[model samples]
Target: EIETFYKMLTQRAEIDRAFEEAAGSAETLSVERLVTFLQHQQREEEAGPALALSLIERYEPSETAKAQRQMTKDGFLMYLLSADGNAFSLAHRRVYQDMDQPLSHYLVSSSHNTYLLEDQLTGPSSTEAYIRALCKGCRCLELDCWDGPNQEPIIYHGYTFTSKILFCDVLRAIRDYAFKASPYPVILSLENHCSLEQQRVMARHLRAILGPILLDQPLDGVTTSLPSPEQLKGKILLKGKKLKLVPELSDMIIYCKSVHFGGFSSPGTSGQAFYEMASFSESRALRLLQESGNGFVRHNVSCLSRIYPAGWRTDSSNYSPVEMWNGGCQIVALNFQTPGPEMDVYLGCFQDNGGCGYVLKPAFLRDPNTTFNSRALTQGPWWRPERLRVRIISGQQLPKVNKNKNSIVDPKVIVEIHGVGRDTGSRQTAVITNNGFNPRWDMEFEFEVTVPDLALVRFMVEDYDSSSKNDFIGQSTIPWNSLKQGYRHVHLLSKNGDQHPSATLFVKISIQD
Candidate 1:
């Protein structure tokens, strides 16, 4: 049987109280003691809250500690899960199912393919087919939402001028569909790509629709805007009865551009894309859970891969899941576009580097030919485990300069550079010196480019293999360049080997691959 959990988030005071409790217990609290308490609380379900309170009461608090503490009950749960290396195994807790696969293993289908659209719950057979083929072993269910002009909640994807779907019908379908009872949690990630007023309408509708049921579980949702916990505190308390809502961190520290519904703008001709910003946002969310006195139950890190600039893909080593995990990320959404091999590499690298427990998603478990497996559910938090290879295509571009006898000219060859097997862009370097001469050159390059509504730009140059041999060339290395105007000039000095004109120069640039 499926057990439904409701979350009612009422007052910021509830979270404030959790923080005070955690703070009160600070002096005598240790990971070991916390673990013991957790173990004891599990069997003593009815007394769990009281026991948690008792533990907090035993701690001594200083003035600074009291003021600094901020956590909700849910935040405390997440902290307990990530507090130690053995926490997941000892407690028999795993964030997501199918832990053996790579992070992108949760994808439902290839990002390249457009899913067949359906208006209403088509038929029982088709619904069962999706459950067996699509939802089987799936870890999360993602939905896109829009607020109707008449204050109705709608669901759909694409721009406002394009196509949109109503949320009322979508929710009714979900509620009507029959899903098998599985341990994996069904995450309903709603993307509010609509206007703020529309979002507010949808939020209001959601509160009304879900009602008491929504309040039963710990609320974990990600949003682009900064939310005031006080505004919804009354509703949360009424519906969820002290359930906590975890807010995502903004990418303000990393990029100052405006992100749409989820924060982080789409990748453009400039510096960072939505994914990097998403990573930045997720990092901050983790920091929020870790440092906030309000206890957070879970942190939903949205769309880990789709936020890259114009050409970047999920495989870029710059995409960091472990970064999120280390910073206290509990839930991460995997974009289906990621290639299998690249996913394997990321998971392997994460575990190899000491990254422990956390969940993989619904996308990873979806098998077109088979139904969901109950047996393959539990995995991970292991050290030095080998996984599969991942194929990721980055949207980064490569540049070439037109060289004259004395100077590099404009109209340089520029092409989109991808992975090892991908095509190389045009040439940028021109032969200027035959004798030993410094390869440093000061030049300005300009290109007409369209920037995303809410994103910045940056760049980087390849490195020389040897430092000792290349050390004579120059001390300062070129940092990744960021797009300022439509044009910018970069100073480049050759490093390593001889300054011989025979040296080959290749410049590859990416927005934030």
Candidate 2:
């Protein structure tokens, strides 16, 4: 598939044309031509011959091309499709982090309403959402249980038109799949609306179906502090109210006891207990950021704070996890099914740390005494800034807006930087008409990012239209911390997060050292 795609990308005649332009009338491809080819791909350094020689050693197709200081046309084409042209190396992206820190010191991948498939009001609720969340390194899952009929509890949006699924099936699926994608423990964030002994029935199913894996008690009576993700691996934890009446259900609520916000300066300076976690709605969390960003960051140093979606979002869209992360909120749960920039940044954030569902917060964020604020600030304590110079060189096989045979695209490329208020904006390349197949946009964009770790570098490709809003072709969003430097391919993913076959944007990156 890749072979055919590249063949179609750089057709037969085009290679000869490019070779002729670079090599001129030389009998053998000259070093100057090789150097130009390397520059076209943005891989050339000041030592053009030295760089070309190294690439020739690895990407040269025939032994003759490298053994002698000579090359053929086929060899040039082969080098175009070589490993040098692919996006950031995949093997370098595996999760890598020290897992010995407290669970509170990590940003956990979490889902807002794990039962909903689409719209929160009319969406269908199923256990499949749980399966999908766990499969993708979501270490925290939310379940809204209301009293149900037929001796089983229900999981769905309360007082809404959404359909329901039995809590038994949800728990059953969670037990089986929680540890498949990540070795970290899964925390069940329960928002209980169950008033009857149907809660008892839910407890019965929990004990029976999720028996051994459920973390019903503290490990070895050492509940002085929260356990690490390493120590709690494969254990399913309950993080909600401890019902004084239902001992069966209450017993499961160890470690993370969901407690009320007791303010940030109470409870003898530490304010929050190590075994307790708190949650705030998006509106409330935004207020905390606006008012006292340092307080919020300081609070999360010892305890977990979950910032969930606002209550009125019937469309199931998400608040920007980037903002929540800037405030150092550990679990910024969002609607995972929505493939918007919010989820894109969240997914990209977890792509590091081994894709292990838990990424340890940076050293500055973990320091309880640090004065790093997420809101309006001219940083005095947390001020490591970065500059990015990106070159939007070209695109290959960008998906066309119209499926018709003769129609083509006048595409524009948007290079956006999403991060702290100080370092967030977008720039674009002017439209290139009638050239969706292979548009050349030798445009450069510069971004100054104050908080590089929290930034998401997004490349948006759109089909320009004068009469209406531009139609989105594809985009690729990656965490700024994970961005690859020098020449790279940004593989495009469609609006629904599906890979667009043979679609990519070639770029050159220069980020601060």
Candidate 3:
């Protein structure tokens, strides 16, 4: 079993190259250095050494070199290149290290209707959804709680045929999996439909399952503004509509005190520094922003705002979160199950901050004294717009997607630039017929971005078809800062952020400010 896994990894070109580089032109990787690499990647103190010793003793190569190809130390190193072994690509680094910023100053990764595994109407709600979302570095989870059969609170779509799960089970699953992916604080965006008594049970279950991790008191003083993530690390916050002001419920609503957004002229602040956090439907929020963007920006300076999908989106489509994000709204919730352009943008924005799921808002958005309006800035060309020129040179070992036994793939590359208020994409490259392993474009494309800090470049390789939509091969998305100036290998990834074994796109980037 282990030999098969080792042989499979050794066949991968990228893994083979990575092993050669790490081994320093040697035939084998020393067990000690391999253990260190594993330990660093896993962020474990002792597990790496233990695992390394076990693999060496159990899968040691025999005397015959040909038969022992899969059992050598080099092959074992290649096996660690698999997804399970290479669990985290970010090296467990703290991406949102600027913990002094206000809670409203960070773009939080959030999920809407987090319990549903499928469509909103007839899907089933499971605890596994929470686990999966949290493990993907989602910090905010939405729960629609209602009175269940046994006086227990259950989570599901309110009037739909969606199956329900006990709210307590969701909480327990959250407690176990929340910090496993990210050590940042978690927010429970609670939509309460339970009776007063059931609400108390909900509170009890939250406190009992989460124990010391649940925040019952404000991280800062009561009068202080929103506290930073550092202050609330490892804590679970409750954000729900104002209930009957019972002690148990009120205690959970410290910083994220949820309130209904009134209008553009509504007062976002109370006497306290962080009291009135606002929630609005997508249409309402979009209308308000379009009507008075300055007012919305000013309101977000002192308060946190949440924008969710409109109720009419029964098909579970997500609105462009960039619209809300430009106004400095902290929690722009999206349907995590849906995969589309909006989710792609959401994933791209958060991909910069170590995928820790929290990205600090830019200075102009968070500045209370500045009169800079993001809407106006993006409406017309700025005084100085940065130019990005990329050369789509070639692709190596591109995967073939056509299922026909006798057919070949005609692959083309498309480069897309997603910015703050606007997005532009280039035309597809000239197709290369009958060659899926190595395709060349040698095409140059340029874009002008008004907001360079919020820009992300995406490259997609697709198989062209005349009668139908093109089949997707693989893609790569990277922030502007991470793009190297000279020739570089742009590693292609699946939609789920996993590397496509040996698929790579070679490109050259030139940026002029």
C-alpha TM-scores of all predictions: 0.27, 0.85, 0.79
Across residues 1-513, which tens digit of lDDT does each residue of candidate 1 receive?
123222322222322343345345454334344434444322223334444444333332333322333233444433332312111121222222334332222222111101113211221112222232122222234455555768765554344232444565544443333133232223334444556566555455555555543333323431332122222222211111011122211111111122332432223423233222222344455444345312111112222222211223312122433333322233333332232322322332222111222233323122222221221212322111211111111111112222234532121111122111111122222222322122322222322222111111112233222222211221111101111111112222232111222222222122321
Worst 10 residues of 1 by lDDT: 387-396
**lDDT, each prediction:** 0.28, 0.80, 0.72
Residue 494 in candidate 3 has what lDDT?
Answer: 66
TM-score of 3: 0.79
Best by lDDT: 2
- RMSD to native for every prediction? 26.5, 4.8, 8.2
What's model 1's TM-score?
Answer: 0.27
lDDT of 3 by residue, 148-256 (tens): 9889999999999999999999999999998887777899988888888998898899888989999988654646567777777788888876545456776788778
Clashes of each: 68, 3, 0
Cα error, candidate 1, residue 52 (Å): 45
Ranking of all predicted structures according to lDDT, beginning with the best and ending with the worst: 2, 3, 1
Q: Cα lDDT of model 2 overall?
A: 0.80
| Residue 470 C-alpha lDDT in model 1 | 14
Better of 2 and 3 by TM-score: 2
